Amino acid sequence: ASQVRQNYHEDCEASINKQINMELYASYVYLSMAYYFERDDVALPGFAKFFKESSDEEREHAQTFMKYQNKRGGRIVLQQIAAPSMQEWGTGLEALQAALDLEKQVNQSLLELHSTASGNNDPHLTKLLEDEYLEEQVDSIKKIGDMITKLKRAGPHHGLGEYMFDKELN
Template sequence: LPGFSRFFYKCSEEERTHALKFIKYQTLRGGRVIFQNIDKPAHDEWGSGLEAMETALALEKSVNQSLLDLHAIASSHQDANLTDFLEHEFLEEQIESIKRLSDYVTNLNRVGAGIGEYLFDRHTLGSDS
């Protein structure tokens, strides 16, 4: 399903850009960036496009919660620069991503597997690229 492939590739590019923003910001603030190993996901194969979208939605919600937790810590330390950075660079975009993925999950549930998923791939995700 080429639409799903393009969609998730585009998402991965966006997440790499976010990582670079954090690296740049931390360096700008005088911090050091220490990289750690990233474990292979527990689930890396999906039986359907719906399952892949549901997994992506859960991951976006998890990232959003982590950003909210970081924002709360920054607020408690009265770090206006970090709270502003998070609000303008990440939090608004996270809500948009969660909304888009939620809509995709809803639509995939409506159209069903097989030809419905194929049409979703072609018409919805095909137009996103």
């Protein structure tokens, strides 16, 4: 085994490799939304910018798990990144609702990864998940929730409300 490995269970190592793929997949979803909102027949530059940034952050999240894997002496195994579930995301509200659902799915996976680390008595992994992932996930979910509510207030259908709310994200 690796000269650095210590108190790092095979199951944690494998679960990290799957979370890497999930972070890369979410980055890919957000990239698809981002350029969907730059179509000439959608033209929502605030939504585009918001999802482009979310795409970058998710790819950074994947890289932090890749650095982590190497740090503990695990070995990174990357799988194919699935095509996004959709090619068209509808209105801003529907994209946000899809992002909300995706963020809570990522959160579920992260909490299961914390349970695996806790079960294998890995406080260093539980610390990483709490400090770097669980905290950021809850803030993201709250922020997307706020945005959904604000957009429902402003007028969620393809109208003046969507146009004005889009300016808030620019």
